[PDB]
Amino acid sequence: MTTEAKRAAKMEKKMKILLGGYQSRAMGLMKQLNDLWDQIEQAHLELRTF
Amino acid sequence: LEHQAVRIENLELMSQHGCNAWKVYNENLVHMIEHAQKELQKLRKHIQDLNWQRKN
Amino acid sequence: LICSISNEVPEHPCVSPVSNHVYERRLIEKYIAENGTDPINNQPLSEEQLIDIKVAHPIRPKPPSATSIPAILKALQDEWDAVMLHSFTLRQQLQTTRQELSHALYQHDAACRVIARLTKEVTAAREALATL
Amino acid sequence: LICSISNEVPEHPCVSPVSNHVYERRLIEKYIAENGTDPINNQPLSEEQLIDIKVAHPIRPKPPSATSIPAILKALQDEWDAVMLHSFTLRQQLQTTRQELSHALYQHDAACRVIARLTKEVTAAREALATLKP
Amino acid sequence: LICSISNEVPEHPCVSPVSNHVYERRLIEKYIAENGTDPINNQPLSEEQLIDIKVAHPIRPKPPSATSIPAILKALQDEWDAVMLHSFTLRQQLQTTRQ
Amino acid sequence: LICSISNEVPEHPCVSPVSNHVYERRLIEKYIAENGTDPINNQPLSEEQLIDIKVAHPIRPKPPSATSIPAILKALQDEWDAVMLHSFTLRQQLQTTRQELSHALYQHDAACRVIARLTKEVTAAREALATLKPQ
């Protein structure tokens, strides 16, 4: 309990960099993935349309 | 106890090295977003050309 | 995701139908142009054999957010490899300490019986010498 | 270890020429055998064009503080819940796409009939207006 | 472990330092005796490389049985991602129908 | 067929052609990935040491047939790894106790021999000066 919450608390406090940067890579990666899928589907749909 | 020791070792290595992978992967995701934007721009250009020909 | 030979992020990735690798158009074009070979397994390949990005699925599935199956497989096998390796080191140390404990037990029985015989001979020599 | 169509340790990894990823022998061999294509990228591919490499692929990320309970429980319910939500969402999406496609076919054939009748009426009135002067 | 043939049995787990696997003294003895080879990979091996137990002691250090933990991830892997590929092609056909 | 560096049911067991042992593909992949070496013999090795084995395993449960409970295999393997770590710590403690008993037996044997020689010289001097007193 003591040492476990101390090591996990210190490691969790030192992980804020990977959490913020990884949350930014997941954020922009998911936004670019959804926007790229919808942009590709609408792109091919408009290309076949016209 | 064994899980606490293994977690202490994993936290000792992760805290002993660093990360840099959040920034590296962030740059990679930025590059992918740039490629997607380029593809969308190309598709918009082609659609614009087709619309121009149809207009003529 | 990233080119192996170029070490950078290629704008137009490609792969030869030999081995699985990420080869840039300029990396596979110049390397394959110099001599025919695969960027990974060095299998026979040409420059035009490499398949350029077909624009089919530029999106691809989302990154493994939250947990991941590869992280559970590699983390479980690696955790069992490190913990099991420590169990192998403790097994070798317990084996060497077990052999040293058996030899120390035999040396403790022979040295204990020799000490008891030395004490018996000392008591017999002191009693027999002091009996007169 | 890390793969798009596997996400585990494959016995015999197989990669497509369009998209390189570790694939199972039965998935790529049977899927590419029935209809030649790439399983992950949905790109055209051939069975003989599959890349052959020994334990070669990229990796993936993962947060810190990895334990057994989040992996087994959180990863099992998260992966199974995501696959179930994707299968059900694809089911309702394909069903609604089939109904909207049926209404689109009805509006296409009916709109073609109304456009044909209106075009024939416009041509008839135009011919009557052209021949009505003499 | 516990399996069907495939030179798998918790008796004399012989392993040759060429292709590392858990085999039997009789299976590798007769199979490697007729012609030297592996039962699957067909790797070169002889009878002299065969040993018993693991590091020491008689009998055998019986490992745990096969729970098919990676095999469940392989079957659910190809099945799941297979339904995602078929559903992806069906999603592309639905996008064409919407176009 | 229990592996030394794995002890789990091997999917693709591997070993380096140095000493005879049952290794794993992940143990030699990560261990040899950090530093190239052989786990059993501490011998140098290359990437060609770890093999794919041959038949892997023919697992019948692989189609779980509606079970769908990976927590049994993952929790069972994790409990076996934790039991292996507890057994490793118990083997290390018993090894330290065996080394302490061996050190106490060695110090008691050397102290018993030195005490025996001191009793021999002290007995020779006590008998010398004792018998030489009336003379």
UniProtKB/Swiss-Prot annotation, chain A:
Locations listed in the record: Nucleus; Nucleus speckle; Cytoplasm
Tissue expression summary: Ubiquitously expressed in both fetal and adult tissues.
Modification comment: Phosphorylated on serine and threonine residues. Has no effect on subcellular location nor on homodimerization. Phosphorylated in vitro by CDK2. Phosphorylation enhances interaction with PPP1R8.
Job of this protein: DNA-binding protein involved in cell cycle control. May act as a transcription activator. Plays a role in pre-mRNA splicing as core component of precatalytic, catalytic and postcatalytic spliceosomal complexes. Component of the PRP19-CDC5L complex that forms an integral part of the spliceosome and is required for activating pre-mRNA splicing. The PRP19-CDC5L complex may also play a role in the response to DNA damage (DDR). As a component of the minor spliceosome, involved in the splicing of U12-type introns in pre-mRNAs.
Assembly and interaction partners: Homodimer. Interacts with DAPK3. Component of the precatalytic, catalytic and postcatalytic spliceosome complexes. Part of a spliceosomal 'core' complex consisting of CDC5L, PLRG1, SPF27, CCAP1, CCAP3 and CCAP6. Interacts with PLRG1, Lodestar/TTF2, and NIPP1/PPP1R8. Component of the minor spliceosome, which splices U12-type introns. Within this complex, interacts with SCNM1. Component of the PRP19-CDC5L splicing complex composed of a core complex comprising a homotetramer of PRPF19, CDC5L, PLRG1 and BCAS2, and at least three less stably associated proteins CTNNBL1, CWC15 and HSPA8.
Family membership: Belongs to the CEF1 family.
Disease with which this protein is associated in UniProt: A chromosomal aberration involving CDC5L is found in multicystic renal dysplasia. Translocation t(6;19)(p21;q13.1) with USF2.
Name assigned to this protein: Cell division cycle 5-like protein
Full protein stretch here: 703 to 752 of 802
From Swiss-Prot, chain B:
Family indicated by similarity: Belongs to the SPF27 family.
Protein name, as recorded: Pre-mRNA-splicing factor SPF27
Physiological role: Required for pre-mRNA splicing as component of the activated spliceosome. Component of the PRP19-CDC5L complex that forms an integral part of the spliceosome and is required for activating pre-mRNA splicing. May have a scaffolding role in the spliceosome assembly as it contacts all other components of the core complex. The PRP19-CDC5L complex may also play a role in the response to DNA damage (DDR).
Top-level taxon of the source organism: Eukaryota
Locations listed in the record: Nucleus; Nucleus, Nucleolus
Expressing tissues: Ubiquitously expressed.
Subunit architecture: Component of the pre-catalytic and catalytic spliceosome complexes. Component of the postcatalytic spliceosome P complex. Component of the PRP19-CDC5L splicing complex composed of a core complex comprising a homotetramer of PRPF19, CDC5L, PLRG1 and BCAS2, and at least three less stably associated proteins CTNNBL1, CWC15 and HSPA8. Interacts directly in the complex with PRPF19, CDC5L and PLRG1.
Signal sequence extent: none
S-S bridge residues: none
From Swiss-Prot, chain E:
Residue span(s) of domain U-box: 1-71
Taxonomy, superkingdom: Eukaryota
Tissue specificity as recorded in UniProt: Ubiquitous. Weakly expressed in senescent cells of different tissue origins. Highly expressed in tumor cell lines.
Transmembrane feature ranges: none
Induction (free text): By gamma irradiation and chemical mutagens but not by UV irradiation.
Compartment(s) where it occurs, according to its Swiss-Prot or TrEMBL record: Nucleus; Nucleus, Nucleoplasm; Cytoplasm, Cytoskeleton, Spindle; Cytoplasm
Task of the protein: Ubiquitin-protein ligase which is a core component of several complexes mainly involved pre-mRNA splicing and DNA repair. Required for pre-mRNA splicing as component of the spliceosome. Core component of the PRP19C/Prp19 complex/NTC/Nineteen complex which is part of the spliceosome and participates in its assembly, its remodeling and is required for its activity. During assembly of the spliceosome, mediates 'Lys-63'-linked polyubiquitination of the U4 spliceosomal protein PRPF3.
Notes on the domains: The 7 WD repeats are necessary and sufficient to support interaction with the RPA complex.
Family classification: Belongs to the WD repeat PRP19 family.
Subunit (UniProt): Homotetramer. Component of activated, catalytic and post-catalytic spliceosomes. Component of the Prp19 complex/PRP19C/Nineteen complex/NTC and related complexes described as PRP19-CDC5L splicing complex and PSO4 complex. A homotetramer of PRPF19, CDC5L, PLRG1 and BCAS2 constitute the core of those complexes. The interaction with CDC5L, PLRG1 and BCAS2 is direct within this core complex. At least three less stably associated proteins CTNNBL1, CWC15 and HSPA8 are found in the Prp19 complex.
Protein name according to UniProt: Pre-mRNA-processing factor 19
